Write a protein that holds these residues in place. Structure first.
Motif, PDB file in Angstrom:
ATOM      1  N   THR A 197     -18.448  -1.876  -3.431  1.00  0.00           N
ATOM      2  CA  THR A 197     -17.089  -2.211  -3.838  1.00  0.00           C
ATOM      3  C   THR A 197     -16.028  -1.511  -2.996  1.00  0.00           C
ATOM      4  O   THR A 197     -14.834  -1.703  -3.254  1.00  0.00           O
ATOM      5  N   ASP A 224     -11.135   8.056  -7.378  1.00  0.00           N
ATOM      6  CA  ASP A 224     -12.457   7.973  -6.767  1.00  0.00           C
ATOM      7  C   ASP A 224     -12.575   8.901  -5.567  1.00  0.00           C
ATOM      8  O   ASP A 224     -13.669   9.400  -5.275  1.00  0.00           O
ATOM      9  N   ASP A 237      -7.987  -1.241   8.393  1.00  0.00           N
ATOM     10  CA  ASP A 237      -8.321  -0.733   9.719  1.00  0.00           C
ATOM     11  C   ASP A 237      -7.279  -1.068  10.775  1.00  0.00           C
ATOM     12  O   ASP A 237      -7.044  -0.254  11.672  1.00  0.00           O
ATOM     13  N   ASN A 296     -20.878   6.549  -0.950  1.00  0.00           N
ATOM     14  CA  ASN A 296     -20.333   5.230  -0.653  1.00  0.00           C
ATOM     15  C   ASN A 296     -21.043   4.608   0.543  1.00  0.00           C
ATOM     16  O   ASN A 296     -21.870   3.704   0.382  1.00  0.00           O
ATOM     17  N   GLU A 297     -20.747   5.094   1.744  1.00  0.00           N
ATOM     18  CA  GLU A 297     -21.277   4.462   2.942  1.00  0.00           C
ATOM     19  C   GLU A 297     -21.268   5.454   4.093  1.00  0.00           C
ATOM     20  O   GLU A 297     -20.725   6.556   3.995  1.00  0.00           O
TER      21      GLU A 297
HETATM   22  N1  K3E Z   1     -10.587   2.819  -6.981  1.00  0.00           N
HETATM   23  C1  K3E Z   1     -10.043   2.358  -5.732  1.00  0.00           C
HETATM   24  C2  K3E Z   1      -9.725   3.564  -4.894  1.00  0.00           C
HETATM   25  O1  K3E Z   1     -10.850   4.245  -4.610  1.00  0.00           O
HETATM   26  C3  K3E Z   1     -11.276   3.963  -3.316  1.00  0.00           C
HETATM   27  N2  K3E Z   1     -12.685   3.880  -3.475  1.00  0.00           N
HETATM   28  C4  K3E Z   1     -13.482   4.777  -3.041  1.00  0.00           C
HETATM   29  C5  K3E Z   1     -13.089   5.922  -2.350  1.00  0.00           C
HETATM   30  C6  K3E Z   1     -12.680   6.827  -1.779  1.00  0.00           C
HETATM   31  C7  K3E Z   1     -12.163   7.966  -1.045  1.00  0.00           C
HETATM   32  O2  K3E Z   1     -11.747   7.585   0.303  1.00  0.00           O
HETATM   33  C8  K3E Z   1     -12.636   7.149   1.379  1.00  0.00           C
HETATM   34  C9  K3E Z   1     -13.163   5.666   1.375  1.00  0.00           C
HETATM   35  O3  K3E Z   1     -12.361   4.756   2.019  1.00  0.00           O
HETATM   36  C10 K3E Z   1     -13.048   3.579   2.060  1.00  0.00           C
HETATM   37  N3  K3E Z   1     -12.492   2.828   3.114  1.00  0.00           N
HETATM   38  C11 K3E Z   1     -12.251   3.286   4.303  1.00  0.00           C
HETATM   39  N4  K3E Z   1     -11.766   2.369   5.038  1.00  0.00           N
HETATM   40  C12 K3E Z   1     -11.668   1.310   4.342  1.00  0.00           C
HETATM   41  C13 K3E Z   1     -11.219   0.050   4.615  1.00  0.00           C
HETATM   42  N5  K3E Z   1     -10.755  -0.315   5.760  1.00  0.00           N
HETATM   43  N6  K3E Z   1     -11.252  -0.800   3.646  1.00  0.00           N
HETATM   44  C14 K3E Z   1     -11.705  -0.473   2.499  1.00  0.00           C
HETATM   45  N7  K3E Z   1     -12.145   0.680   2.236  1.00  0.00           N
HETATM   46  C15 K3E Z   1     -12.134   1.603   3.123  1.00  0.00           C
HETATM   47  C16 K3E Z   1     -14.497   3.976   2.348  1.00  0.00           C
HETATM   48  O4  K3E Z   1     -15.329   3.388   1.456  1.00  0.00           O
HETATM   49  C17 K3E Z   1     -14.455   5.491   2.140  1.00  0.00           C
HETATM   50  O5  K3E Z   1     -15.498   5.920   1.381  1.00  0.00           O
HETATM   51  N8  K3E Z   1     -14.676   4.491  -3.335  1.00  0.00           N
HETATM   52  C18 K3E Z   1     -14.670   3.384  -3.958  1.00  0.00           C
HETATM   53  C19 K3E Z   1     -15.666   2.594  -4.476  1.00  0.00           C
HETATM   54  N9  K3E Z   1     -16.900   2.919  -4.424  1.00  0.00           N
HETATM   55  N10 K3E Z   1     -15.338   1.484  -5.025  1.00  0.00           N
HETATM   56  C20 K3E Z   1     -14.106   1.163  -5.110  1.00  0.00           C
HETATM   57  N11 K3E Z   1     -13.134   1.856  -4.647  1.00  0.00           N
HETATM   58  C21 K3E Z   1     -13.383   2.994  -4.063  1.00  0.00           C
HETATM   59  C22 K3E Z   1     -10.586   2.772  -2.893  1.00  0.00           C
HETATM   60  O6  K3E Z   1     -10.383   2.963  -1.592  1.00  0.00           O
HETATM   61  C23 K3E Z   1      -9.295   2.903  -3.637  1.00  0.00           C
HETATM   62  O7  K3E Z   1      -8.437   3.767  -3.003  1.00  0.00           O
END
Ligand code: K3E
Ligand code: K3E
Ligand code: K3E
Ligand code: K3E
Lengths: 259, 259, 259, 259
Positions: free
Chosen positions: B156, B45, D145, B117-118
């Motif tokens: 997600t 992703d 985080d 994403n965000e």
């Molecule tokens: N398939 C799983 C792998 O894909 C990643 N992923 C992604 C991505 C990506 C590329 O990196 C940057 C993302 O880090 C996420 N992120 C940051 N800080 C985070 C935290 N503290 N907690 C959870 N998230 C965090 C933010 O959202 C950033 O955008 N997008 C999605 C999605 N839409 N849905 C499900 N997983 C997704 C996921 O993180 C896994 O690694």
């Protein structure tokens, strides 16, 4: 036009209702609690919920208005001081309508129900087990206290206390939240609240016990020999009378942050 | 038609990319990384997120496809074994498109950004204070670690870890979640996640410090002399190539419950 | 010495119990289910909970052992393959004891109960209202689904699903968690879980309805004309037989992260 | 005896400090900010935190007192109107002492720190990965985080905003909470807060990047070439001067429910 007024039943609400009927008598407005075109609830959000269910078979022909004799409500968002002004602007027909989505609930053993806030499913004691099926595919096997499916305007109610998101009512959707799920190697649930668009069907199916406590808004019913509980956004909508701008996020701020 | 393929950069992704280019050479398909009509991401992703931002100025003229060489992704939802089948069905044009909403971010000192994403706002150390304004009315004064505004498909990701709801991407909306807010008699926040429809504008405004860490997807930028951060659902959308049914709730189940 | 063995009741547990009795017959060990000094539970954590309550009046004279014929339990933490080794090391007396704190519950109309996991209070339908008094001062007026007071070893059970913290059982304390509290300008609760030391008394007092669903571990009782529910860390403790190091955090890791 | 007074630095605190020095001059009380036996903080909980760290090498020989010129604090729990009464009862020695546990933090590359509230570990941008080891066994691989380890009296601070439980300070323990952990098939964390007794050691170990933002109370330090961060309940304790009963749960109620 035909109207009716329901009251919470305390002194303040009963006599505000009697004063509004008196003011309505000064206009071409007929009191009819069988086929009203205007339904006025005086009390709280609970009084409004009763008024909605009292006339749920004529929703397409009714405009609802809520007056709060206590604190501000999300449906009873009119202050009693504005009651006399409500009478005139509403006798003239100086108002349009806003409509909030509703939740359709189908219980099969078949019965259908409409919810303005939410519908919940709970066990007859301890934890229960149901299979959650989304659009005919199995999503999870839930074990815990219960589940809650909320309308947009219902997200500030039971849904909020369960950790759900607050949704603006212009979004036609429904939201599912969990009630104290057990999560381990055996049982696995999503945990996060889930927001579904129209035409999506969420089906709860029994595993062992088939007796559940099913609620729709303020009414709680024990159901037996239940084979399925289905949720989807209803095609019907509740229609409010709109006389003034009172945004949803303003009511959220006034209710939970400070008035 | 013109196409391009980006790779995560490991051995498995680079040589799956070289094999797809070879298969594409057997068709009327020209490799062009300046004006491609098809963008293929091979990796995770994160690789797809880079591909989206690499071509964010030609979104209306590009169909995206994601291939996961590791575990299943929400954007990289195609298995490497189906790579050869992807080539033919996509050279013929045997596909329609599905579109997911995007988040528009405006930073004024003015710069605009699109997020798949965000977008998040954090302090330059410790807690920060921002006034949250919804549709030009003050909603809350937030003190804490940060805020996060997510797209539907982004729920997600960071949004999920912050307690937000999971939203189906057919809903054109954005969701705001809090990062460790302090709640007391002085500072008061809603706590619940908030879901906004189109045309609603959420504005973050500085109180004391005006230096913030602003992120858009994987990119994190320190911004200085910031006067306002505005969020709203973008009029633009990302377009995916659709060859087969892989429902959003299936990807949720496969990713978080079990594959 | 005198011992007894309780069984979950399935085929695997009944015949492991019959084999342990056979091995015990090869030692100076007398089977007595009236005054046993050793109580062996074969099944799951639920079977152990029943064994504890079956002999709650002779806790100071009993050492408990739990064997899990299914997945690992927090009380049934012995694998069935080690059953024969349990017999010898326990006939010789090659073991010391570890003791976990218990929760004392007093219900006044007066009855006292001991809980190994937790004790909960719920409404007879919908939400209920109770005043929470800590050490004779009013702390909050709770409106919601219920409250849960957990022992340290009980924090991995109902308490965990309610958002409570996991406490090592060497800490003599009790933890209170909320069940879907409504928080607004009218009703205000702490929200966070509360951990109390010994000698602290938490008292729940009825407001309107005085009929509550009171649970102690797996037993759920409807109580009427209840005037008060008091919680405090019990002076009594449950005593386990210790043959080997199996740390609490290891059991937490093995149960919730992966075995 | 020797005393000193620190001030927040605003007009109200500086002149209450000057008035207390004047009242102290009317007694056998010598002002000494090098070896005081009494340390008075006038301002907020932040001012008290600075006073504690200003004299953290003479904790066993100092009694702390906190005065709040603004709202009630958990350490600055004395109202400015009682300042003159504080002078006399404290010149006579008409007081005993209460002691709250502290958190010891060891950072190896070695440096040790004491925390009155908490110590946190965060990434130098985005999410970070650390292995969590409890008593020399690997418990989880955390990606998110950050993490927060709180003292009992610190649970009402950063710990509370992270979902931790509120612990009475008579319990010698420490509590660990998570900061937006990502939980999926790859990364798995406990989620629940963890409460550790004395002599238990929690060790955070780097995986890829070895540069972390480490905080101890109000001070935030960027640390490089970090090999380990170890947490355990300190053998040292902070000593308060006690003139009157102001229970911890009263301060919790007054701070978060209503005064
Ligand atoms: N398939 C799983 C792998 O894909 C990643 N992923 C992604 C991505 C990506 C590329 O990196 C940057 C993302 O880090 C996420 N992120 C940051 N800080 C985070 C935290 N503290 N907690 C959870 N998230 C965090 C933010 O959202 C950033 O955008 N997008 C999605 C999605 N839409 N849905 C499900 N997983 C997704 C996921 O993180 C896994 O690694
Ligand atoms: N204005 C505040 C007063 O109005 C109430 N209210 C109502 C209502 C009503 C009539 O009672 C039944 C409702 O009890 C709510 N409820 C049950 N168990 C709950 C719990 N454990 N936790 C929070 N809720 C719970 C469910 O949702 C039922 O539908 N509807 C809304 C709404 N939409 N938004 C904001 N408040 C609303 C609210 O409860 C206040 O009392
Ligand atoms: N090993 C896992 C199996 O053992 C169960 N278990 C038990 C037990 C037991 C026997 O049943 C009654 C328990 O149901 C739990 N419970 C109720 N409603 C619940 C809910 N809504 N959500 C989570 N819990 C709930 C309460 O706590 C009751 O006491 N005790 C523990 C423990 N101390 N730690 C870890 N697991 C434990 C667990 O439930 C698993 O099934
Ligand atoms: N009386 C209320 C005022 O006092 C503050 N306060 C303090 C303090 C202080 C001095 O600043 C640094 C603290 O910032 C807190 N903090 C950081 N980031 C935070 C966040 N994202 N969310 C909540 N907290 C956060 C951490 O804990 C740091 O230690 N200590 C306590 C306590 N023990 N209990 C109750 N309040 C306490 C509180 O913050 C109020 O301002």
């Amino acid at each position: 036009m035909k109207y009716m007024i329901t009251s919470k039943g305390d002194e303040k609400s009963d006599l505000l209702r009697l004063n509004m009927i008196a003011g309505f008598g000064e206009y071409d407005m007929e009191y009819d609690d069988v086929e009203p075109e205007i339904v006025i609830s005086i009390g709280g959000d609970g009084t409004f919920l009763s008024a909605f269910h009292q006339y749920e078979e004529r929703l397409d022909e009714i405009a609802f208005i809520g007056i709060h004799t206590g604190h501000l409500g999300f449906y009873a968002d009119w202050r009693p001081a504005e009651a006399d002004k409500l009478v005139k602007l509403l006798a003239k027909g100086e108002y349009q309508k806003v409509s909030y989505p509703l939740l359709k609930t189908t219980v099969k053993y078949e019965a259908t129900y409409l919810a303005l806030n939410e519908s919940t499913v709970k066990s007859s004691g301890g934890p229960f087990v149901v299979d959650v099926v989304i659009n005919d595919i199995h999503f999870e096997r839930f074990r815990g206290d219960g589940l809650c499916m909320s309308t947009p305007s219902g997200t500030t109610a039971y849904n909020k206390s369960l950790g759900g998101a607050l949704m603006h009512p212009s979004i036609e959707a429904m939201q599912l939240t969990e009630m104290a799920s057990i999560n381990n190697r055996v049982y696995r649930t999503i945990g996060s609240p889930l927001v579904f668009p129209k035409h999506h069907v969420v089906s709860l199916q029994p595993v062992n016990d088939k007796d559940f406590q099913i609620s729709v808004d303020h009414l709680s019913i024990l159901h037996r020999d239940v084979q399925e509980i289905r949720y989807e956004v209803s095609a019907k909508k509740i229609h409010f009378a709109r006389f003034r701008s009172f945004p949803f996020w303003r009511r959220v701020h006034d209710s939970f942050i400070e008035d």
